[PDB]
């Protein structure tokens, strides 16, 4: 078994702060921001050996990434950016960096009490999204 153990499960969005502003800073257009911002996704995290899979299921888009910690991969984001992503496990936090067009955003996923707290940062703008077990 593993420490990445505390992330496995089906996590439903329960609260969001500043996500519209984060998306604006990322470069997401009006209509996509509106529709994406409405969604209440489930974030489904599973582990099989060294491979971690994170699925996002929602009324807007269903997305999935599978990766090995520390090993860069291709990701197409829900807003259709083509990004180069690397995910590491640092001090018990999953740290996800996306690079594209000379830009960068960092997404951290942390267990706090019975929640999964996700912090997304694009320059000075941070959004916090809180998820609970489904």
Ligand X SMILES: O=c1[nH]nc(-c2c(N3CCCCC3)nc3ccc(Cl)cc3c2-c2ccccc2)o1
Nearest CB to ligand X, comparing residues 1 and 69: 69
- Please report, for residues 3, 5, 33, 95, the alpha-carbon distance to residue 91 in angstroms, rounded to integers and kept in the order given: 10, 14, 32, 10
| Min separation Cβ 50 and ligand X, Å | 21
Any long-range contacts for 93-100 (C-beta under 8 Å, 24+ apart)? Answer: 94/4, 94/7
22 annotated among ligand-binding-site residues: no
Closer residue to ligand X (CB): 13 or 91: 13
Residues whose CB is less than 8 angstroms from the CB of residue 83 and which lie 6 or more positions away in sequence, other chains included:
74, 75, 76, 77, 98, 99, 100
Count Cβ atoms below 10 Å from residue 37 Cβ, excluding itself: 14
Q: Which is nearer to ligand X, 1 or 24 (CB)?
A: 24
Q: How far is the CB of 5 from ligand X (least distance, A)?
A: 19
Minimum CB distance to ligand X, residue 11 (Å): 8
Instruction: Point out which residues bind ligand X (CB under 6 A).
Output: 13, 23, 28, 32, 36, 39, 41, 43, 56, 58, 60-61, 77-79, 107, 118, 120, 129
Pick out the residues of the known binding site for a fatty acid: 129-131
């Amino acid at each position: 078994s593993h420490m990445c153990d505390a992330f496995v499960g089906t996590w439903k969005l329960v609260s969001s702060e500043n996500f519209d502003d984060y998306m604006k800073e990322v470069g997401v257009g009006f209509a996509t921001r509106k529709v994406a911002g409405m969604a209440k996704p489930n974030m489904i995290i599973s582990v099989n050996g060294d491979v971690i899979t994170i699925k996002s299921e929602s009324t807007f888009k269903n997305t999935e990434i599978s990766f090995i910690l520390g090993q860069e991969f291709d990701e197409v984001t829900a807003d259709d950016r083509k990004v180069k992503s690397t995910i590491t496990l640092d001090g018990g936090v999953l740290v996800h960096v996306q690079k594209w067009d000379g830009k960068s955003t960092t997404i951290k996923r942390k267990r706090e009490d019975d929640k999964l707290v996700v912090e997304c940062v694009m320059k000075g703008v941070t959004s916090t999204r809180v998820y609970e077990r489904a």
